[PDB]
Amino acid sequence: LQFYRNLGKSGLRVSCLGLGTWVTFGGQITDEMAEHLMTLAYDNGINLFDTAEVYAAGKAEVVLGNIIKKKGWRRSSLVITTKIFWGGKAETERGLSRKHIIEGLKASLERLQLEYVDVVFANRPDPNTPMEETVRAMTHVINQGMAMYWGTSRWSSMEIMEAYSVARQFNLIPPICEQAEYHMFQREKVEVQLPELFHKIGVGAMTWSPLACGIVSGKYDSGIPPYSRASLKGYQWLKDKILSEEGRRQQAKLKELQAIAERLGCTLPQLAIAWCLRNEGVSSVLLGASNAEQLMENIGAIQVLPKLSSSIVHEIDSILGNKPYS
Amino acid sequence: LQFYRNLGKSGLRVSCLGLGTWVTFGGQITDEMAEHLMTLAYDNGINLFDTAEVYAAGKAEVVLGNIIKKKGWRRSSLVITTKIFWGGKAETERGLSRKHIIEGLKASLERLQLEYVDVVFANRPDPNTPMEETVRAMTHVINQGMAMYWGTSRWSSMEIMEAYSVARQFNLIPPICEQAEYHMFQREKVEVQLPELFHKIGVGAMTWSPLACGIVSGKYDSGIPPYSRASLKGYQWLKDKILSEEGRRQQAKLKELQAIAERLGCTLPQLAIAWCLRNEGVSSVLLGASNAEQLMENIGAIQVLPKLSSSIVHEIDSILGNKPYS
Amino acid sequence: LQFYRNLGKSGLRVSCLGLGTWVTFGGQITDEMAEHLMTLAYDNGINLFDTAEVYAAGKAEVVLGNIIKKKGWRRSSLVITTKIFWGGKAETERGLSRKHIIEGLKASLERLQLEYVDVVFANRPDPNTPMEETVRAMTHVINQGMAMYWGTSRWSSMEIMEAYSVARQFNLIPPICEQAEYHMFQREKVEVQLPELFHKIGVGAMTWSPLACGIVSGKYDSGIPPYSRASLKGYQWLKDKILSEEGRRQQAKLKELQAIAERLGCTLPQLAIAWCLRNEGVSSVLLGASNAEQLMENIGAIQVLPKLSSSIVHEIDSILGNKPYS
Amino acid sequence: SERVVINISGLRFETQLKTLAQFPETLLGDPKKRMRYFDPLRNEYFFDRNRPSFDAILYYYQSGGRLRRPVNVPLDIFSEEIRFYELGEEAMEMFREDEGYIKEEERPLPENEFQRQVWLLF
Numbered sequence A, B, C: 001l002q003f004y005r006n007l008g009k010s011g012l013r014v015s016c017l018g019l020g021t022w023v024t025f026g027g028q029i030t031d032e033m034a035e036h037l038m039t040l041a042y043d044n045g046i047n048l049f050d051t052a053e054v055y056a057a058g059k060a061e062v063v064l065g066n067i068i069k070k071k072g073w074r075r076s077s078l079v080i081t082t083k084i085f086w087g088g089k090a091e092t093e094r095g096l097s098r099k100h101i102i103e104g105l106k107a108s109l110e111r112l113q114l115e116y117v118d119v120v121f122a123n124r125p126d127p128n129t130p131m132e133e134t135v136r137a138m139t140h141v142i143n144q145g146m147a148m149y150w151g152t153s154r155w156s157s158m159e160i161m162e163a164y165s166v167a168r169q170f171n172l173i174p175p176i177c178e179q180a181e182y183h184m185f186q187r188e189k190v191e192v193q194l195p196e197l198f199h200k201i202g203v204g205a206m207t208w209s210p211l212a213c214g215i216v217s218g219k220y221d222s223g224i225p226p227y228s229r230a231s232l233k234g235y236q237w238l239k240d241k242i243l244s245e246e247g248r249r250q251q252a253k254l255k256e257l258q259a260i261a262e263r264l265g266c267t268l269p270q271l272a273i274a275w276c277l278r279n280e281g282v283s284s285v286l287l288g289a290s291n292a293e294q295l296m297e298n299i300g301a302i303q304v305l306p307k308l309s310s311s312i313v314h315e316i317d318s319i320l321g322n323k324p325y326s
Numbered sequence D: 001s002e003r004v005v006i007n008i009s010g011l012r013f014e015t016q017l018k019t020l021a022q023f024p025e026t027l028l029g030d031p032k033k034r035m036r037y038f039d040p041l042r043n044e045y046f047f048d049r050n051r052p053s054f055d056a057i058l059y060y061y062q063s064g065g066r067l068r069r070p071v072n073v074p075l076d077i078f079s080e081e082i083r084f085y086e087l088g089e090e091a092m093e094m095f096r097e098d099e100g101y102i103k104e105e106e107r108p109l110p111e112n113e114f115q116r117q118v119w120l121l122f
């Protein structure tokens, strides 16, 4: 219902929908389209934009930064987040060591042309760095004013609880968010493991790939459309999943959900997105969009949210038949 | 008696009377008058000037800053305080989150043309931000040298004690002052709730609106004078209170106090102001003045303070008949 | 014996003799003489120079700074110390509040043309500022790299222990030194109260006025010489002490010590200075000198130190008859 | 549920403010009475007193009335603490009953002058 939500239990208020830059910015789409997308999003109340040092080898950060600079939007009305982990081919340019977290963020901030990001995320867990070193480094860049808050991404709840625990032991700053993948065909972590953490230590979830890269949109009912992501050079893995045995199965279930969509009076993408937002543990959902049509349609998911009643949800679970065990 | 007092139990010494900038600076009065007012105040030993990001949408800070810069007064002989909370129309531009406290203060300091303020206040409580996030952010801007101390405003004693408590738990810096409204018709909080906090954790009070925006001056005995605050465009709420049923009642009691004033040999405003200063828990009283006449008269409240004996105070309580329950 | 000593139990090594700037720099002597004095001192291994914001209203810091800048000595071979407390006529320009400690040191460093001092001292205790506020501020300027260490001056051992205690409680930095007055006619504090603190919490003493402003030199045996300090405009208080009843008594005892001096083969000033250095609790002794003759003679006190045997010291106690009670 | 920390000669105790507020007339239950023992640097109340006794005093608030003397604490000491924490006479009486003691009577010849005079030899 509320368009703006608190990210976990922190004071940072984000729009329940954000726009990311994976694949698109500095990649699939043009700089002018990227600008068009962000303007549309910003003008619609969306204040959350996500990027990463690894996206198009730092190219997405530059495009995102050029737009913010060109449009002259006030920095205080924006919530920029960036992820750190893979920053180069050198051995010391990847991971969550203190060296890479500081060097990585400094280089991202440079490409972004910003003095700081609102939230810096560890793109993934690092089995090779002690939790203390990572928590201390996240705390250091925050006290240096390079970031306002920090979060995790693809971490288990055990790991997130560890970071929180180490933070309390040394009087460091605990993470406030976990960027987890969440969509109709990926529900375990967000629905089974993160809720306890949200109530226990205020960690909220900012979910990604709500349409499973497009799969859940329904554009793959027949085959691989021209100019779709599954067709793009470099995304063969994606094409395989769609044509997979499991792929066909998902597409079949999508046709069943297509009926739930019409009953609710919305499109499939709007339902898929609004679905991800039904649970309170989810602070925001990061959207992907290769053009302005998709973004405009997807933002409509907000009017569907009020319609997601117990019954409809239980029916959607029946069709999916993948509801996670408690 | 002592013109200079410690703000609460901190080492910061403030004049028992300060001059604020709400309504007037960048608003009701001209920049030349504002300059005249501050010069008068400064030349009379007043070293405390209060402003806020919200006052005239940042306009008052600019005027205050231009004066300090123009007059060339030494920064070490001034005590500038500014309040943070409402800083813009964006969702992320209001509140006590770490993002807004740092962004808000940075923008105020910019408008003020100062490297730091002596005390930064949270303009009001923020139900949406964890106390830890706020206390940590206040501590961060102080360690960054953007502020020397921090305080609360319109917080309950429960909330102030919470901020202090969280500060001790994490080894952060506790607030030293609470900016509370205090005048003959608003006495509960300052007289009943803050004294325990002053003796227990050194929090002092810096009270505002000692004349209830002019009501307690006596200029409204008849009706709404021309050029008064109650007449100004935008202060209809104030005009309503004065003409209210309760309004007439207050004006009647003011005529009774008018006798206590002559017995003490002073004007009503001087009595109203000196009254606020009778209790030790009150470190300083922030004055409002639309012109030099008012300021000169009001500063005279200091010679009345010695005359406020037990008897006179008990008589003033009789007339008011609103003495708060212990 | 050892020319260089550790200041208290810290790692900072100071020459057992230092040169101060009270009265002389920017005052009694000329800038060229001041330069001559410092060069002589520096070329003789003395690495400790003491000043204060209050000395000649900031004038001594400027002269000291011009010399260091002119001579091009490496900053790492110098130990500059400055005291903070009286910094102006304003109410907020004196004391040990956080505001004045930061503002005061920043202004001194500016006059000194240095990025930092090695040790900043609180010139005296401040009954009006909580110990926590002072310890936190000393810690803040040290973490800001404005000072390397901090110390007290004219504080009781109760107060010094309090600062240390508060430092441990909040994980702040404890003071390492106390600048106390020490000479043949002022021995209580250094000999009775500070030794426990030196062994218990590593606080060392850096004593001042070893010749009691010249009294112990013997230049006042007859009357007030021309150009002496006791004659200078502004030091009437000093002249009174010398002509006092007690003054005559001291001068008489000085004639008795004059014999101990010849027995040891040195001048009275060299004995008076070497005496102050006999106890280990004294890290260094700050010298005063209005000209190069005095400095050259006084530095000779170091060859006398080895001769201060139990017997001689007990004899000197007999003559003084003011040995403090244990 | 503001928490309250009580430090007894170094032994740390914590409880909720409403737990102490349950008995407004006692030392720990009276803000004006405990004020004197608060350490603003450590956010705790400090009492330089007997340690073994306190578990019992605190439990008295938590249990809502039960005042038992710890098996290992002398009766002379524990009663001195009961008095110090001003638990009140109604509680001390019931405490002393359960502890064993209990009694008291007499009253010399009411006036009489001479009645109460003889009634002192027989």
Ligand SMILES: NC(=O)c1ccc[n+]([C@@H]2O[C@H](COP(=O)([O-])OP(=O)(O)OC[C@H]3O[C@@H](n4cnc5c(N)ncnc54)[C@H](OP(=O)(O)O)[C@@H]3O)[C@@H](O)[C@H]2O)c1
Residues within 6 Å of the ligand: A019, A020, A021, A022, A024, A050, A051, A083, A123, A153, A154, A179, A207, A208, A209, A210, A211, A212, A213, A214, A215, A217, A219, A227, A228, A229, A230, A269, A286, A287, A288, A289, A290, A291, A293, A294, A295, A297, A298
């Ligand atoms: N590890 C991490 O932290 C992580 C990982 C991945 C992503 N993320 C975040 O999440 C965002 C990406 O989400 P996502 O892009 O992967 O899944 P989506 O579900 O966010 O993917 C959207 C993509 O699918 C297609 N699509 C979207 N809406 C459509 C519509 N209404 N009709 C038809 N097609 C539509 C688009 O066109 P095309 O099919 O033509 O391309 C678009 O490029 C990124 O911006 C990133 O910041 C984070």
Ligand SMILES: NC(=O)c1ccc[n+]([C@@H]2O[C@H](COP(=O)([O-])OP(=O)(O)OC[C@H]3O[C@@H](n4cnc5c(N)ncnc54)[C@H](OP(=O)(O)O)[C@@H]3O)[C@@H](O)[C@H]2O)c1
Residues within 6 Å of the ligand: B019, B020, B021, B022, B024, B050, B051, B083, B123, B153, B154, B179, B207, B208, B209, B210, B211, B212, B213, B214, B215, B217, B219, B227, B228, B229, B230, B269, B286, B287, B288, B289, B290, B291, B293, B294, B295, B297, B298
């Ligand atoms: N939440 C907060 O923290 C908060 C809120 C409000 C204010 N404050 C602080 O407190 C200050 C304001 O106090 P206030 O202005 O609201 O109440 P006052 O009681 O401080 O109000 C003074 C205003 O009333 C009238 N007045 C004052 N003295 C007079 C006299 N001797 N004779 C006739 N009229 C007189 C003036 O002329 P007019 O009637 O012609 O205008 C003046 O503009 C501000 O500067 C602000 O910094 C803080």
Ligand SMILES: NC(=O)c1ccc[n+]([C@@H]2O[C@H](COP(=O)([O-])OP(=O)(O)OC[C@H]3O[C@@H](n4cnc5c(N)ncnc54)[C@H](OP(=O)(O)O)[C@@H]3O)[C@@H](O)[C@H]2O)c1
Residues within 6 Å of the ligand: C019, C020, C021, C022, C024, C050, C051, C083, C123, C153, C154, C179, C207, C208, C209, C210, C211, C212, C213, C214, C215, C217, C219, C227, C228, C229, C230, C269, C286, C287, C288, C289, C290, C291, C293, C294, C295, C297, C298
């Ligand atoms: N509160 C504090 O922390 C504090 C207070 C005071 C001083 N201090 C430090 O201690 C230093 C001052 O010590 P002080 O100057 O007060 O006592 P001294 O005992 O250090 O005083 C030396 C002064 O006495 C005279 N004198 C020195 N040696 C002489 C000699 N061999 N023969 C004849 N006369 C001689 C000098 O000439 P004149 O007699 O002609 O002037 C000189 O100006 C300062 O530099 C200051 O930094 C610290």
